[PDB]
Amino acid sequence: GPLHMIDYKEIEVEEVVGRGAFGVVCKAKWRAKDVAIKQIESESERKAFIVELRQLSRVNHPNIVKLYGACLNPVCLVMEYAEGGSLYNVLHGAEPLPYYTAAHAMSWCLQCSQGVAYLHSMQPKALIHRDLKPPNLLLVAGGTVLKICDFGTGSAAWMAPEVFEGSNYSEKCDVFSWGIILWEVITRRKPFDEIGGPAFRIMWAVHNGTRPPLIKNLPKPIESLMTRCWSKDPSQRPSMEEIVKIMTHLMRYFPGADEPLQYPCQHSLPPGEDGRVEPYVDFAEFYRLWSVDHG
Ligand SMILES: COc1cc(C(=O)NCCCN2CCN(C)CC2)ccc1NC(=O)c1csc2c(=O)[nH]cnc12
Numbered sequence: 001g002p003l004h005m006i007d008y009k010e011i012e013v014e015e016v017v018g019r020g021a022f023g024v025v026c027k028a029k030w031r032a033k034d035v036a037i038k039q040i041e042s043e044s045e046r047k048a049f050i051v052e053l054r055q056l057s058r059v060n061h062p063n064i065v066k067l068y069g070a071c072l073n074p075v076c077l078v079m080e081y082a083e084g085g086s087l088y089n090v091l092h093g094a095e096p097l098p099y100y101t102a103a104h105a106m107s108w109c110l111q112c113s114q115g116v117a118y119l120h121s122m123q124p125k126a127l128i129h130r131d132l133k134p135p136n137l138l139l140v141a142g143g144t145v146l147k148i149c150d151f152g153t154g155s156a157a158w159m160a161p162e163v164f165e166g167s168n169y170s171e172k173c174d175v176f177s178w179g180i181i182l183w184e185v186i187t188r189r190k191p192f193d194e195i196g197g198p199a200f201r202i203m204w205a206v207h208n209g210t211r212p213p214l215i216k217n218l219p220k221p222i223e224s225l226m227t228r229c230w231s232k233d234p235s236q237r238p239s240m241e242e243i244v245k246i247m248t249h250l251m252r253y254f255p256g257a258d259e260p261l262q263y264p265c266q267h268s269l270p271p272g273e274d275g276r277v278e279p280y281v282d283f284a285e286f287y288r289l290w291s292v293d294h295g
Helices: 045-056 087-092 102-120 172-187 199-206 222-228 240-253 284-293
Strands: 014-018 024-030 032-039 066-073 075-080 137-140 145-148
Touching: 045 066, 045 075, 087 137, 087 172, 102 145, 102 172, 102 240, 172 222, 172 240, 222 240, 240 284
Parallel strands: none
Antiparallel strands: 014 024, 024 032, 032 075, 066 075, 137 145
């Protein structure tokens, strides 16, 4: 994949937007375009930069961030800027938070799965992301388009049990993360927020078979897919190609996914009545459109 060698003098650094897995991300300008720059912190991070640069150049897909080029003094990546920020901020960030619909929730998960399915179908060997979570999912086009970034080649809430076991893992670990993200956008809750302390407490819980609470009034095909994705045995989880197909076909019953995020939302989180939670999104329209198609 062809890419530019950037002269640092052509870069005009504006403001710091965030701090990813490694390095610092900053808003900037380069040749009229609005860009984002991931810059090195410690000289030790150099190995991670070679990996991410090797991979981002190799990949080309609408749901994975564009790499425009790389500057080597100082060593930094020049990528496309995501105007809407991360999904984590949209979900759980500072007030005021945007209102979103079930349609948005489904579309975000579809676009995410589409990007991952592409990664799993690389030649000659598949790419495993290893770090799928809302902080690494970015939003553009008024919140309607999702991009994947921060390749994994505080993540315990999304991590498959075989990964933190140090055990042998396949691309099916990405599928587990996707299941958690799906639960997360439907409920607008932080997964395992009730479990306090440090990371090992989550890891212990998930290792015993602790999963997120089931959702009240959730459509059985969605529930079926969600719980399949978070199976202990990686074999019992569906492939991403299957997920992409299912989610594409469900979008028939979720119109309006192309409406930009623009409405305010004052969000208070109720407690879980039984062992279940109420969704943030509403499924009344789904059931209406479904019954119209089915008998
Ligand atoms: C997560 O990083 C971002 C935050 C905000 C963001 O939230 N914007 C700044 C908020 C401005 N505030 C100021 C205060 N005001 C009251 C509200 C608006 C906007 C854009 C980001 N990232 C990228 O474009 C990006 C491109 S590639 C890449 C990567 O590999 N890793 C992490 N990020 C990126």
